[PDB]
Design a protein around this nucleic acid. Structure first.
Lengths: 70, 78, 208, 144
RNA sequence: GAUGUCAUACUUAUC
């Protein structure tokens, strides 16, 4: 249905540069997949620990700067 | 490297029960249990991600003789 | 004008309280300072939903009431259930005939027993702190364990009777712990039979 | 008999198929006929007890080979071959002390089992289909 | 999830 995809915020293109520039079809879906195993496995390659400060981190350079600042 | 796959578990086992079983060999950072949302039952497998790869390898090598509800639970590297 | 989440996380001293919706407000620094305060309470998660925090538990089953021990120890609940069972079997003529000539003495249990239950047998309920807020799934999230100790349910599922003798009361994974050594994730963990005395440490584990 | 209409804790009706609420009883019967309700309906032991045991005297001959034991057994007149298996000394009838070795025992149906203790850890293989043989023409059993 | 017509039920010691 188009109404359930328009009211819940679906069918909206979002780019995540951390996990190899993956695509996400929802802000809440991206927020749920941020605290998941795929985002943790993508962030473990750069050397950043899985914490609460890198929840809204998308770019690799911003996450590296946030890891180096702490 | 830090995630170990545990199989051979019954459907009656729960995720806090699996966490308390896995905490006897080492602190697990995360535990994921794939289950079908249509029926509400587990698939008999899980993934325990620890804080390091050596602790996960020790938990996989030390849980080779674990029996839950009469069924032997196997631990492998993933 | 509106900065991103990375600049708001790098400028604030506590980037863990920064969210994605706080970057498009009228004061990101003031919101980051108020959210990372000492005694501040966070906003509820139902402010961005679309069900008004009351349309989630529609078809879920719920118990009618949970009576405490001080109210159930007075015998009023069984008498009320018996009166509700006796009143449900009466017809309209039996209900109309009891209104002109009623039968006194319905239960007539006691008069000081309720005062003794409300004054002498008063029990304090399980309260909570002011910071622990309530949500829709807070009543169902009850999963929120220690190394070296096992519960009764895990011991019944694994088939390990807990006893003072350390012969069979440790699990059979202790043979691998004796062959390979102590776990590297817990250096202070002491198990009986390997690094602890067996009749002394009868708890099958100690974190010292 | 509708398996979707249930009673809540507030004296109302609840349709779990469409997840709808109804206050009175007259609205629950009128909610089954409609578009959303139709859309939700369209979218959704014997061989062990009979074994004779007279325990005859077996004839085993061991020989240290280099690169094997020969057990002389009588005629059994059956297709069941005698099986060899390696077990531990922890289980016994009287449980003697200082039992920390292994024993390979060969057993048949009309005859008793013959066991030989092996002090070494691993010097051969006690598998049945790998390194065992039973000639039924001469009734000679060997295992190496 | 919203819209616009109809029905049911509820609240403020309202008259």
């Amino acid at each position: 249905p188009y109404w359930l995809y328009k009211l819940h915020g679906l069918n909206i293109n979002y780019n995540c540069e951390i996990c190899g520039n993956y695509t996400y079809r929802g802000p809440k879906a991206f927020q749920r997949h941020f605290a998941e195993w795929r985002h943790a496995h993508g962030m473990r390659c750069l050397g950043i620990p899985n914490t609460a400060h890198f929840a809204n981190v998308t770019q690799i350079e911003d996450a590296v700067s946030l890891w180096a600042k702490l | 490297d830090a995630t170990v796959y545990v199989g051979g578990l019954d459907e009656k086992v729960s995720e806090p029960l699996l966490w308390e079983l896995f905490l006897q060999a080492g602190p697990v950072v995360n535990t994921h249990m794939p289950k079908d949302r249509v029926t509400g039952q587990h698939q008999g497998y899980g993934f325990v991600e620890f804080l390091s790869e050596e602790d996960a390898d020790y938990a996989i090598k030390i849980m080779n003789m674990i029996k839950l509800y009469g069924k032997p639970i196997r631990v492998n590297k993933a | 004008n509106r900065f991103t989440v990375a600049e708001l996380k790098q400028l604030v001293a506590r980037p863990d309280v920064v969210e994605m919706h706080d970057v498009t407000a009228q004061d990101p620094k003031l919101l980051v300072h108020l959210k990372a305060t000492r005694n501040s309470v966070p906003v509820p998660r139902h402010w961005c939903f679309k069900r008004k925090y009351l349309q989630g538990k529609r078809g879920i089953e719920k118990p009618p009431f949970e009576l405490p021990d001080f109210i159930k120890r007075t015998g009023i609940q069984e008498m009320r259930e018996a009166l509700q069972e006796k009143e449900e079997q009466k017809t309209m003529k039996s209900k109309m005939r009891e209104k002109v000539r009623p039968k006194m003495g319905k239960i007539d249990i006691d008069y000081q027993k309720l005062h003794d239950a409300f004054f002498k047998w008063q029990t304090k309920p399980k309260l909570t702190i002011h910071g622990d807020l309530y949500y829709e799934g807070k009543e169902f999230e009850t999963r929120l364990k220690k190394p070296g100790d096992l519960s009764d349910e895990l011991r019944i599922s694994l088939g390990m009777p807990v006893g003072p003798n350390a012969h069979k009361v440790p699990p059979p994974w202790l043979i691998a712990m004796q062959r390979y050594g102590p776990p590297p994730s817990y250096p202070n963990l002491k198990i009986p039979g390997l690094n602890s005395p067996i009749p002394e440490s009868c708890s099958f584990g100690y974190h010292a | 008999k509708d398996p979707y209409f249930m009673k809540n804790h507030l004296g109302s009706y609840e349709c779990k198929l469409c997840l709808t609420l109804h206050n009175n009883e007259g609205s629950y019967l009128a909610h089954t006929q409609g578009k959303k309700h139709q859309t939700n309906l369209a979218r959704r032991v014997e061989v062990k007890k009979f074994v004779k045991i007279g325990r005859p005297g077996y004839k085993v001959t061991k020989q240290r080979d280099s690169e094997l034991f020969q057990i002389d057994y009588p005629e059994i007149a059956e297709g069941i071959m005698p099986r060899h298996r390696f077990m531990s000394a922890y289980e016994q009838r009287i449980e003697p002390p200082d039992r920390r070795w292994q024993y390979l025992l060969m057993a048949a149906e009309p005859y008793e089992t013959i066991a030989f203790k092996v002090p070494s850890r691993e010097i051969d293989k006690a598998e049945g289909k790998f390194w065992t043989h039973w000639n039924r023409e001469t009734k000679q059993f060997f295992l190496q």
